[PDB]
Symmetry: C2
Subunit: 682 residues, 2 copies
Amino acid sequence: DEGMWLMQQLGRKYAQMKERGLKMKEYDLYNPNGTSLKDAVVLFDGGCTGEVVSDRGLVLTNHHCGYDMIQAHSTLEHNYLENGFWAMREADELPNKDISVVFIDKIEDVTDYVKKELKAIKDPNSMDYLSPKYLQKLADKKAGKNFSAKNPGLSVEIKAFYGGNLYLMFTKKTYTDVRLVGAPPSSIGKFGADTDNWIWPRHTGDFSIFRIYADKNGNPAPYSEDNVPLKPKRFFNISLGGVQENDYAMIMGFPGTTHRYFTASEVDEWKSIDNDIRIRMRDIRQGVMLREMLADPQIKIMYSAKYAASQNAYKRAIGANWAIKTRGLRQNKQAMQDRLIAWGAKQGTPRYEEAVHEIDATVAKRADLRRRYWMIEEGIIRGIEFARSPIPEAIDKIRTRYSKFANKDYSAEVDKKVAVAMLTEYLKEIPYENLPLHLRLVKDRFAGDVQAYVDDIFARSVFGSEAQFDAFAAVPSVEKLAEDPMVLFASSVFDEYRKLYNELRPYDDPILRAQRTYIAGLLEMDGDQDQFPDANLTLRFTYGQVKGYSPRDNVYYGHQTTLDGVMEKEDPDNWEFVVDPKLKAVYERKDFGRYADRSGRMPVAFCATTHTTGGNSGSPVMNANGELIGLNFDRNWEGVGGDIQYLADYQRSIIVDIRYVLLVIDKVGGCQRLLDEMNIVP
Amino acid sequence: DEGMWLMQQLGRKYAQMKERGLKMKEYDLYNPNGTSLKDAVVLFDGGCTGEVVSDRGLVLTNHHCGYDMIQAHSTLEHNYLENGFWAMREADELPNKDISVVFIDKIEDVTDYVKKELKAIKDPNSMDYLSPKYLQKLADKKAGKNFSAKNPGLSVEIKAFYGGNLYLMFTKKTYTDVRLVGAPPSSIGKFGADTDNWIWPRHTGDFSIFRIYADKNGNPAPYSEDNVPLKPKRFFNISLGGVQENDYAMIMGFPGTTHRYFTASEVDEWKSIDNDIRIRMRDIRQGVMLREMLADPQIKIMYSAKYAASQNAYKRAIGANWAIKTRGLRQNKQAMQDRLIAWGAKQGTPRYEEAVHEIDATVAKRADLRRRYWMIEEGIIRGIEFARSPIPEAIDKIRTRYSKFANKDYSAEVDKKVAVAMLTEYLKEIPYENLPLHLRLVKDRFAGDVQAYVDDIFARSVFGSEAQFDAFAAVPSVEKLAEDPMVLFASSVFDEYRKLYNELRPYDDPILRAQRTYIAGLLEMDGDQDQFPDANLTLRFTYGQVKGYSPRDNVYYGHQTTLDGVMEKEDPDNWEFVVDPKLKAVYERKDFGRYADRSGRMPVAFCATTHTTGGNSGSPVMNANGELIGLNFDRNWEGVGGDIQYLADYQRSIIVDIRYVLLVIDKVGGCQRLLDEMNIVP
Ligand SMILES: [K+]
Ligand SMILES: [K+]
Ligand SMILES: [K+]
Ligand SMILES: [K+]
């Protein structure tokens, strides 16, 4: 069900959560002064969520969240990334550089304190009410001096909610000694990673395992051999009971951004500039790359990862544009704004309408700039690799940047072909007068011939090939460098990119100010029960049910995938559909232990109507009694519009069944000590 | 449910059909001496099925069955193919050249008569028992002389069933004055034709309408303005009641070929030679074409139809190979043969085992020939367009064939690129000693360089370009013609193709003889109740239920598609997903008359567990009471293995809901006179 709720809103949502099946007492889920399930959720390394799953500090998160650490410890001698990793004793758990888990020790509503302090600011249009610097100076003041002395490992932060109509202060407890314990092989962790990105059904065992280490008294400590496992205040019990269609499910984690309070005009802008441009440009770029990768095996090797990273946000944009076109997103925001405008007229209060027209007017005014901005960023800055060629003892410094640019995955021939297709589109859309200066040479010097222009850049640039770089220096002429067509291209586009960004930047603030007023209206009118605050990287809960959906006429996706699905998808030639041979043998023997359903089918993943976004990677998924039933890892493309409007009949969180995580730990890892330390319940 | 049953087997299947829901009396469906529903089914123009749907001779069949006739009557002035056609009076119904509908007036079991007559044939290995000539001489003898004089429009034919263990005689009544009445626009008739070939869900309104005209007494007559509508003996009532999940459904029509009695060894051969070769070669050819069509808009125009025709059997082979790999087809045939072999040992009868080993031994022996045959047919004869370049007043005759070969859809550059890829694969697989002679020049004259060889063919052939043809004649040297590299290529490959076909041909007869014995065993052992005779282009019935299925883990396709599905798929830029504007407006207004379900959803198509194959295009689909509920038009790719082994959990007939046909006649055609003449019942 809809929304990413504040902990403070639990009481407002409690009735609704019970209607959907919640059996826990409010206090056991969250409370302000004691121990609750909230104390088992962590913010894992800056973005991801994770969860404490034993009384000795074991932490579960996704495989994609732990990927950097597993990769850091991997060698060709011990390739943990391909094979998995299972530490067979606590002493073999691997420390990690520059890692953190944060617990949210305390949350406090400080809206009154902040609005009082904001009264000193004389200027009515100051943006200090959202300034991270200013809010932290308020935080530090409220926490008193000596705070850090009196509270090992604690810190404070104030954040704005509801466009600056509400402020919370969080007290955070940060551990930096977090050690890798367990990871399945990549074939399991990344099963279908690219082809099935944003797809349900899904068959990925997307998990990894860490442990929080600390001092003898549980205080945060920097890494040392004398640190011991944290004995946490609360950890999750692990359910073996599974899930059924319609079962209650809930998630806590740290969603990043949403846009629930867009006006109709911002929706139109989001479609017609941001999404349309990303779609057109990435389709061009992807289409040339693909053609090259198909034609040449070595180019598939060099480019498949740049190809997949492009497709990631491309797919998201397609899905968002689909919702706009088919699910009524613009109309929903139109109705929200017209409701408040009728209401305000009746209250004799014109400021809500004026705020909506201010937003409208700013979006209208910035239109051509924004379009130019997106065209250049999607078309060139991201789209053409040689846009990031180097710009000027110092030759050795230049060589380093050249080497990074023309690295072992770079093909000058692919880059030229990509550039020709992207610039042809860019030049059709951007008129001569608004071009980055160097691109005026297409008309002026090459008579409209984009292939000739791009050919010339490579023919004469000292960065056009290694021998061209080697011959340049060798015999540096400084002199040649100042006329280099690549350098002048690169400089020229980044100069236009920069100047566009600077002229657009100021248009943000009027919109932000009006949103304060807009959201204040909405909340006065209808209250907060069905108007969640936009996500802002802070702890939130969401609740829903275990449920499939219909993607299109006469097709249904159910709520649960199985191991039978993995084997169906098995392809030993494609690295993303490789099946691990120990998991294959488990399947052949039906060696499922107590983790399969009564009918002998082994669950892999499930989906639910919870409301999640980027930042909910690794989030624990709880059942009606708060026991762990799964780990959140993706969402379906039909639901990406849900950052703007939740879609009950389409949006799903995609979740790894905790029974499958246990299976993999047991039968693939053989890591029995990790099951015995968890509290595994019926 | 399984099988394509003889009319004569209706009594054997009757109990089973009633268990599935049939409420008709046996006699009303089929009987030997009176009127039954069988008298409303026709064999439409040689291959398709159709059905009589009024007391004035209206005939329903598929749009793809009627396509040639609609296309024959179409002009740029009156393009009936794009717009549809609706004759607003009987006098405006269009006659068609060289068309037929055949009714099966009588069927008679003549096995005894034929086995008696076969006793004259002295040679035990004569293939006369399956010879169409010989069986027709028996037919004519049995029908007496003067048969055709005493029976206007009647003819007789004998056919072999069950590998020559059963013979039926049919008396056929043939009408040649069959006029086009009604056709939806192609956008409806062919909605998704290519992209959704062999796909369920499906959204195609695949129907057309004809009328049988005859003399004043209902006798067949050649076309004349004095002919009148046939007043048929039986026609189908049309149901408006629709279908629900699990409803009984049945079909009669004219299935072509099946291979129910394959041995395990024939299954392995079918996979590893016929299907593997068609898959590899067509994937190569398709992959070069696609690359070209993507690169050039004019090449997409010229080649999309050759591209789709290749994909048609390619897709079927993929689906068949999928069933072999995942659905146990080889094992089913192994078990059938080992059952009969244990049985025969117990009967003290070794001839069933010896028959199975004879088949085995023939398949083994022909293996390399068959492989060579398929390689050359898929790789070159079908795969390379210039293999069918011309082979030599007579220059004008040559020019005609050249013009057909190098027509407005032919690209020499595409042809060369295709040829290079196909010959590279062909030459890797076929050793020098077995090559068509001209292809030995790749090794011998061009040092392994297939691009140089193919380039030379085009450089020097008088068929390599129009100017090259024009310059040749002009100045014919005969002399140049006898050395022409294309002519010598063409001749060379057709010579090898021919010689392979001739050496393979004789291997068919031992297999056929052993199948007689093999099937005789199977039928002695288990009887005919669950062992249908292989399809042989004769009238058969099949029964099943209206039911969806699961294609893969966690996905379900339901039993019924709707108009909502058409609109979801709408793409005005792609000709196959164009939605007709009158159907679009109908949808927008929900102008569904009495044709939609109680919930306001308008059905388009449904699927059922009946057992169909090629030749069931246009087959009537009946409900429990024999009323028409739909028109069969395709089957799903998961079920194409069903020609060898029926798959209950996968194989479906794909059927146009008769309520959608009525909707289209009414709201798109405006052809009310066609509804008023039908008998439309609740
Ligand atoms: K994703
Ligand atoms: K987001
Ligand atoms: K088909
Ligand atoms: K067939």
